[PDB]
Short mmCIF file of all heavy atoms in Angstrom, two decimals:
data_model
loop_
_atom_site.label_atom_id
_atom_site.label_comp_id
_atom_site.label_asym_id
_atom_site.label_seq_id
_atom_site.Cartn_x
_atom_site.Cartn_y
_atom_site.Cartn_z
N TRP A 230 -178.40 -173.07 13.28
CA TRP A 230 -179.67 -172.60 12.72
C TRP A 230 -180.58 -172.00 13.79
O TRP A 230 -181.31 -171.03 13.53
CB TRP A 230 -180.47 -173.72 12.07
CG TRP A 230 -179.91 -174.38 10.84
CD1 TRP A 230 -179.19 -175.53 10.81
CD2 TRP A 230 -180.08 -173.97 9.48
NE1 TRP A 230 -178.87 -175.85 9.51
CE2 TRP A 230 -179.41 -174.92 8.68
CE3 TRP A 230 -180.72 -172.91 8.85
CZ2 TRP A 230 -179.38 -174.84 7.29
CZ3 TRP A 230 -180.68 -172.82 7.47
CH2 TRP A 230 -180.01 -173.78 6.70
N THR A 231 -180.56 -172.60 14.97
CA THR A 231 -181.52 -172.26 16.01
C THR A 231 -180.81 -171.95 17.32
O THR A 231 -179.63 -172.23 17.50
CB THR A 231 -182.50 -173.42 16.27
OG1 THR A 231 -181.81 -174.49 16.92
CG2 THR A 231 -183.08 -173.93 14.98
N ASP A 232 -181.56 -171.36 18.25
CA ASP A 232 -181.02 -171.08 19.57
C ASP A 232 -180.65 -172.35 20.32
O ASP A 232 -179.55 -172.45 20.87
CB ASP A 232 -181.99 -170.24 20.38
CG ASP A 232 -182.01 -168.79 19.92
OD1 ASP A 232 -180.95 -168.29 19.47
OD2 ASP A 232 -183.08 -168.16 20.02
N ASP A 233 -181.54 -173.33 20.31
CA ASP A 233 -181.33 -174.56 21.07
C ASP A 233 -180.23 -175.46 20.48
O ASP A 233 -179.68 -176.31 21.19
CB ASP A 233 -182.65 -175.32 21.28
CG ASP A 233 -183.70 -174.49 22.00
OD1 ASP A 233 -183.32 -173.54 22.72
OD2 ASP A 233 -184.92 -174.76 21.84
N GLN A 234 -179.93 -175.29 19.20
CA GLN A 234 -178.79 -175.97 18.59
C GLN A 234 -177.51 -175.22 18.96
O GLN A 234 -176.47 -175.82 19.19
CB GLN A 234 -178.91 -176.00 17.07
CG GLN A 234 -179.84 -177.04 16.48
CD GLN A 234 -180.16 -176.68 15.02
OE1 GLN A 234 -179.86 -175.58 14.58
NE2 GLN A 234 -180.76 -177.61 14.28
N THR A 235 -177.59 -173.90 18.98
CA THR A 235 -176.45 -173.08 19.34
C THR A 235 -176.06 -173.31 20.81
O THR A 235 -174.88 -173.32 21.14
CB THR A 235 -176.72 -171.61 19.06
OG1 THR A 235 -176.75 -171.41 17.65
CG2 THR A 235 -175.63 -170.73 19.65
N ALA A 236 -177.06 -173.51 21.67
CA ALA A 236 -176.82 -173.90 23.06
C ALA A 236 -176.06 -175.21 23.13
O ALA A 236 -175.14 -175.37 23.94
CB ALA A 236 -178.13 -174.04 23.81
N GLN A 237 -176.46 -176.17 22.31
CA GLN A 237 -175.75 -177.44 22.26
C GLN A 237 -174.27 -177.23 21.91
O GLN A 237 -173.40 -177.80 22.56
CB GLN A 237 -176.42 -178.41 21.30
CG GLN A 237 -177.60 -179.15 21.93
CD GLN A 237 -178.36 -180.01 20.92
OE1 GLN A 237 -177.91 -181.12 20.59
NE2 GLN A 237 -179.50 -179.51 20.42
N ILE A 238 -173.98 -176.39 20.93
CA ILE A 238 -172.58 -176.09 20.61
C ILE A 238 -171.80 -175.57 21.82
O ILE A 238 -170.67 -175.98 22.05
CB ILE A 238 -172.45 -175.07 19.49
CG1 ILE A 238 -173.07 -175.61 18.21
CG2 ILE A 238 -170.97 -174.74 19.26
CD1 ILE A 238 -173.06 -174.61 17.07
N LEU A 239 -172.39 -174.66 22.59
CA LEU A 239 -171.70 -174.15 23.77
C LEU A 239 -171.42 -175.29 24.75
O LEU A 239 -170.32 -175.36 25.32
CB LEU A 239 -172.50 -173.04 24.44
CG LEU A 239 -172.74 -171.82 23.56
CD1 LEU A 239 -173.33 -170.65 24.32
CD2 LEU A 239 -171.40 -171.45 22.93
N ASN A 240 -172.40 -176.18 24.92
CA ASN A 240 -172.26 -177.32 25.83
C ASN A 240 -171.13 -178.23 25.41
O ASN A 240 -170.34 -178.69 26.24
CB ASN A 240 -173.54 -178.15 25.89
CG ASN A 240 -174.66 -177.45 26.64
OD1 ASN A 240 -174.41 -176.53 27.42
ND2 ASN A 240 -175.90 -177.88 26.39
N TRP A 241 -171.08 -178.52 24.11
CA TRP A 241 -170.06 -179.40 23.59
C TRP A 241 -168.71 -178.79 23.86
O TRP A 241 -167.77 -179.49 24.23
CB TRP A 241 -170.26 -179.64 22.10
CG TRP A 241 -169.14 -180.43 21.47
CD1 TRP A 241 -169.09 -181.78 21.29
CD2 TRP A 241 -167.92 -179.91 20.94
NE1 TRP A 241 -167.91 -182.13 20.68
CE2 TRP A 241 -167.17 -181.00 20.45
CE3 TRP A 241 -167.37 -178.62 20.84
CZ2 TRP A 241 -165.92 -180.85 19.88
CZ3 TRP A 241 -166.13 -178.47 20.25
CH2 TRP A 241 -165.41 -179.58 19.78
N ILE A 242 -168.60 -177.47 23.70
CA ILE A 242 -167.35 -176.78 23.99
C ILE A 242 -166.94 -176.90 25.47
O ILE A 242 -165.78 -177.15 25.78
CB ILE A 242 -167.40 -175.30 23.55
CG1 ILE A 242 -167.58 -175.20 22.04
CG2 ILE A 242 -166.13 -174.57 23.94
CD1 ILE A 242 -167.80 -173.78 21.56
N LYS A 243 -167.90 -176.72 26.37
CA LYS A 243 -167.64 -176.86 27.80
C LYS A 243 -167.13 -178.27 28.13
O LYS A 243 -166.23 -178.43 28.94
CB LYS A 243 -168.92 -176.56 28.60
CG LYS A 243 -168.82 -176.77 30.10
CD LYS A 243 -167.80 -175.84 30.76
CE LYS A 243 -167.85 -175.99 32.30
NZ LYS A 243 -166.50 -176.01 32.97
N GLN A 244 -167.73 -179.27 27.51
CA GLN A 244 -167.33 -180.66 27.72
C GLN A 244 -165.97 -180.99 27.09
O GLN A 244 -165.06 -181.48 27.77
CB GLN A 244 -168.40 -181.59 27.16
CG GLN A 244 -168.06 -183.07 27.14
CD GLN A 244 -169.30 -183.94 26.93
OE1 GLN A 244 -170.41 -183.60 27.38
NE2 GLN A 244 -169.12 -185.07 26.24
N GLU A 245 -165.85 -180.74 25.79
CA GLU A 245 -164.64 -181.12 25.06
C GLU A 245 -163.44 -180.18 25.15
O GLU A 245 -162.30 -180.64 25.19
CB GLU A 245 -164.97 -181.44 23.60
CG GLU A 245 -165.90 -182.63 23.44
CD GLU A 245 -165.25 -183.95 23.84
OE1 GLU A 245 -164.03 -184.14 23.57
OE2 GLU A 245 -165.97 -184.81 24.41
N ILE A 246 -163.66 -178.88 25.05
CA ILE A 246 -162.53 -177.97 25.26
C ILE A 246 -162.36 -177.41 26.69
O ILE A 246 -161.26 -176.99 27.07
CB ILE A 246 -162.57 -176.81 24.23
CG1 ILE A 246 -162.93 -177.35 22.84
CG2 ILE A 246 -161.26 -176.05 24.20
CD1 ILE A 246 -163.07 -176.27 21.76
N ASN A 247 -163.42 -177.45 27.48
CA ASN A 247 -163.42 -176.82 28.81
C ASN A 247 -162.76 -175.43 28.90
O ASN A 247 -162.05 -175.15 29.87
CB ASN A 247 -162.89 -177.74 29.91
CG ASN A 247 -163.46 -177.38 31.27
OD1 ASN A 247 -164.10 -176.34 31.43
ND2 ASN A 247 -163.22 -178.24 32.26
N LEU A 248 -162.99 -174.57 27.91
CA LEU A 248 -162.51 -173.19 27.94
C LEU A 248 -163.64 -172.18 27.72
O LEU A 248 -164.64 -172.49 27.07
CB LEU A 248 -161.42 -172.98 26.88
CG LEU A 248 -160.08 -173.67 27.11
CD1 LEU A 248 -159.19 -173.53 25.88
CD2 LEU A 248 -159.39 -173.10 28.35
N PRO A 249 -163.48 -170.97 28.26
CA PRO A 249 -164.46 -169.90 28.03
C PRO A 249 -164.48 -169.41 26.58
O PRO A 249 -163.44 -169.36 25.90
CB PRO A 249 -163.95 -168.77 28.94
CG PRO A 249 -162.48 -169.05 29.10
CD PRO A 249 -162.39 -170.55 29.16
N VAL A 250 -165.67 -169.05 26.12
CA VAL A 250 -165.84 -168.54 24.77
C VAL A 250 -165.78 -167.02 24.84
O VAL A 250 -166.63 -166.38 25.45
CB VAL A 250 -167.19 -168.97 24.18
CG1 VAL A 250 -167.37 -168.36 22.82
CG2 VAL A 250 -167.26 -170.50 24.11
N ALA A 251 -164.74 -166.46 24.22
CA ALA A 251 -164.44 -165.04 24.33
C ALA A 251 -165.38 -164.21 23.49
O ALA A 251 -165.98 -163.25 23.98
CB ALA A 251 -163.01 -164.76 23.93
N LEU A 252 -165.50 -164.60 22.22
CA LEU A 252 -166.29 -163.84 21.27
C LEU A 252 -166.76 -164.73 20.11
O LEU A 252 -166.22 -165.81 19.90
CB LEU A 252 -165.48 -162.67 20.72
CG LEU A 252 -164.28 -163.14 19.91
CD1 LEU A 252 -164.69 -163.37 18.46
CD2 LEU A 252 -163.13 -162.15 20.01
N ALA A 253 -167.77 -164.26 19.39
CA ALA A 253 -168.24 -164.92 18.18
C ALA A 253 -168.39 -163.92 17.04
O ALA A 253 -168.84 -162.78 17.24
CB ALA A 253 -169.57 -165.63 18.41
N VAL A 254 -168.01 -164.35 15.85
CA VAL A 254 -168.22 -163.53 14.68
C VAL A 254 -169.15 -164.30 13.75
O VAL A 254 -168.95 -165.48 13.49
CB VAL A 254 -166.86 -163.18 14.02
CG1 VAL A 254 -165.96 -164.37 14.02
CG2 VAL A 254 -167.06 -162.68 12.62
N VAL A 255 -170.21 -163.64 13.29
CA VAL A 255 -171.18 -164.25 12.39
C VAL A 255 -171.09 -163.57 11.03
O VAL A 255 -170.88 -162.37 10.97
CB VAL A 255 -172.61 -164.15 12.94
CG1 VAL A 255 -172.79 -165.11 14.13
CG2 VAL A 255 -172.92 -162.71 13.33
N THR A 256 -171.22 -164.36 9.97
CA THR A 256 -170.79 -163.94 8.63
C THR A 256 -171.81 -163.29 7.66
O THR A 256 -171.43 -162.82 6.59
CB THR A 256 -169.97 -165.06 7.93
OG1 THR A 256 -170.81 -166.20 7.70
CG2 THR A 256 -168.81 -165.48 8.80
N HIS A 257 -173.09 -163.28 8.01
CA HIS A 257 -174.05 -162.41 7.32
C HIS A 257 -175.40 -162.56 7.99
O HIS A 257 -175.57 -163.46 8.80
CB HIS A 257 -174.12 -162.70 5.82
CG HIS A 257 -174.49 -164.11 5.48
ND1 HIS A 257 -173.56 -165.11 5.38
CD2 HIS A 257 -175.70 -164.68 5.23
CE1 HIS A 257 -174.18 -166.25 5.07
NE2 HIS A 257 -175.48 -166.02 5.00
N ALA A 258 -176.38 -161.72 7.66
CA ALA A 258 -177.63 -161.88 8.39
C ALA A 258 -178.57 -162.81 7.63
O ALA A 258 -179.30 -162.39 6.73
CB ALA A 258 -178.28 -160.50 8.58
N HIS A 259 -178.64 -164.03 8.12
CA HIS A 259 -179.40 -165.11 7.50
C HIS A 259 -179.60 -166.11 8.61
O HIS A 259 -178.79 -166.16 9.53
CB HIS A 259 -178.55 -165.75 6.40
CG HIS A 259 -178.96 -165.35 5.02
ND1 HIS A 259 -178.49 -166.00 3.89
CD2 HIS A 259 -179.79 -164.38 4.58
CE1 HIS A 259 -179.03 -165.44 2.82
NE2 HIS A 259 -179.81 -164.45 3.21
N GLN A 260 -180.61 -166.97 8.49
CA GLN A 260 -180.84 -167.94 9.54
C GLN A 260 -179.70 -168.94 9.67
O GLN A 260 -179.28 -169.27 10.78
CB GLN A 260 -182.16 -168.67 9.37
CG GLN A 260 -182.59 -169.23 10.69
CD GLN A 260 -183.75 -170.18 10.60
OE1 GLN A 260 -184.18 -170.72 11.62
NE2 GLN A 260 -184.26 -170.42 9.39
#
């Protein structure tokens, strides 16, 4: 929903998957 929640997702990925995020696809323009 928010930038600071989306940052948390990236962090969780760094911790749990430890891989680079290549790309993101977002599914419509809405919050």
Side-chain angles (χ1 to χ4, degrees):
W230 294 96
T231 71
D232 285 329
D233 302 336
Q234 282 163 348
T235 290
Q237 277 174 79
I238 299 176
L239 299 189
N240 288 340
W241 173 93
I242 297 173
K243 176 63 173 138
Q244 172 164 327
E245 297 292 323
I246 318 177
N247 206 350
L248 290 171
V250 177
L252 65 87
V254 42
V255 288
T256 65
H257 58 273
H259 256 192
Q260 202 191 179

